[PDB]
Write a protein that binds this DNA or RNA. Structure first.
Ligand SMILES: Nc1ccn([C@@H]2CS[C@H](COP(=O)(O)OP(=O)(O)OP(=O)(O)O)O2)c(=O)n1
Ligand SMILES: [Cl-]
Ligand SMILES: [Cl-]
Ligand SMILES: [Mn+2]
Ligand SMILES: [Mn+2]
Ligand SMILES: [Mn+2]
Ligand SMILES: [Mn+2]
Ligand SMILES: [Mn+2]
Ligand SMILES: [Mn+2]
Ligand code: NA
Ligand code: NA
Ligand code: NA
Ligand code: NA
Ligand code: NA
Length: 328
DNA sequence: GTCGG
DNA sequence: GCTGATGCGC
DNA sequence: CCGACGGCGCATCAGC
């Protein structure tokens, strides 16, 4: 049903291999950019030289596309699929907190399966231990109905802590997705500005007291990463990833732009900002110094002002998701 | 792996 | 302590 | 060994 789905799946799989096995994050990012520009292309790709016209597809991917169109497979991928070490390394990196490095370490020490991982809980740090505990739950996506229920608990508890907080659910939810991988809550409070608690900790602690937050992956002064769960209906819902991030109140628009994603959109926007002579992060957009210090932050009164600076047409959150096209 | 310089 | 990497996460 | 590639929080380490 997906136009060019065979091609985009091949490139994604190559991506994951370069990240997890090769530890080559820019090759990962290259395959992702290629899968992405191909996914958004509104025609069926006839040949490698056709895909090559797209930014991000070059000689080597063009050849893989010719091989794939011609044979229905890619020998490079068949060999990777046959490498049990590579397969186990890929699998282990699905646990939150285990990356390419840890994964290879565990596999080299003979941990190759989920059971093997469970038997070796003592090798895992806290984050990894919690990732493992909820591995099955974290594989499932969250229906938007349940995201609405989750949003209701979060906003009500935050308002009980202090009515000056504003919490906004971002990520895929704000982009209008019909399901989400986690819940991203952007939080502000007038006591925390770029110039100026316990602000985050008070919120987290209140969510724990009402048994909504069940576990913590990591937690600092400005960012919480953890686990939550909706109250059961009779006798249970899966446990869910939740990210909460306090951002400076005077820097809300850069913050919400960031927290809305998608991942690929944000990166592409920042790459286009560099080309135009700016640097964008979640707090500011700044001109690049002739030296190599960014200069003073530019004024921003809306999401659109950020786009304007880098000469990009404004996109509504729903148009910042990745998309694909279909065939009959 | 792709691209720009 | 601070700075700057390394790993891993949004 | 062309070098850059988006950018930063939290956890941790190395060097000072
Ligand atoms: N590589 C990345 C990853 C995330 N981000 C930011 C962090 S906050 C925002 C949303 O990140 P998430 O990882 O929750 O993704 P989405 O909400 O798009 O999807 P799901 O959670 O999978 O529904 O994008 C980024 O700028 N670069
Ligand atoms: Cl790389
Ligand atoms: Cl900044
Ligand atoms: Mn579809
Ligand atoms: Mn398109
Ligand atoms: Mn062993
Ligand atoms: Mn999300
Ligand atoms: Mn998230
Ligand atoms: Mn551009
Ligand atoms: Na190209
Ligand atoms: Na191997
Ligand atoms: Na992981
Ligand atoms: Na053990
Ligand atoms: Na569960």
């Amino acid at each position: 049903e997906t136009l060019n789905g065979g091609i985009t799946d091949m490139l994604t799989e190559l991506a994951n291999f370069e990240k997890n096995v090769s530890q080559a994050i820019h090759k990962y990012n290259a395959y992702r950019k290629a899968a992405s520009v191909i996914a958004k292309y509104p025609h069926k790709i006839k040949s490698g030289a056709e895909a090559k016209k797209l930014p991000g597809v070059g000689t080597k991917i063009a050849e893989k596309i010719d091989e794939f169109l011609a044979t229905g497979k890619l020998r490079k991928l068949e060999k990777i699929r046959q490498d049990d070490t590579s397969s186990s390394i890929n699998f282990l990196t699905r646990v939150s907190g285990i990356g390419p490095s840890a994964a290879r370490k565990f596999v080299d020490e003979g941990i190759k399966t989920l059971e093997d991982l469970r038997k070796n809980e003592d090798k895992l740090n806290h984050h990894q231990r919690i990732g493992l505990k909820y591995f099955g739950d974290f594989e499932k996506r969250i229906p938007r109905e349940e995201m609405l229920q989750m949003q209701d608990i979060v906003l009500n508890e935050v308002k009980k802590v202090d009515s000056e907080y504003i919490a906004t659910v971002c990520g895929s939810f704000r982009r209008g997705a019909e399901s989400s991988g986690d819940m991203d809550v952007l939080l502000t409070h007038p006591s925390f500005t770029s110039e100026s608690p316990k602000l985050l900790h008070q919120v987290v602690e209140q969510l724990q007291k009402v048994h909504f937050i069940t576990d913590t992956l990591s937690k600092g002064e400005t960012k919480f990463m953890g686990v939550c769960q909706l109250p059961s209906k009779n006798d249970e819902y899966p446990h869910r990833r939740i990210d909460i991030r306090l951002i400076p109140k005077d820097q809300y628009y850069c913050g919400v732009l960031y927290f809305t994603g998608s991942d690929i959109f944000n990166k592409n926007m920042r790459a286009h900002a560099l080309e135009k002579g700016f640097t964008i992060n979640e707090y500011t957009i700044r001109p690049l110094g002739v030296t190599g210090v960014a200069g003073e932050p530019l004024p921003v009164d809306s999401e659109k002002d950020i786009f304007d600076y880098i000469q990009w047409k404004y996109r509504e959150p729903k148009d910042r998701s990745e998309h694909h096209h279909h065939h009959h």
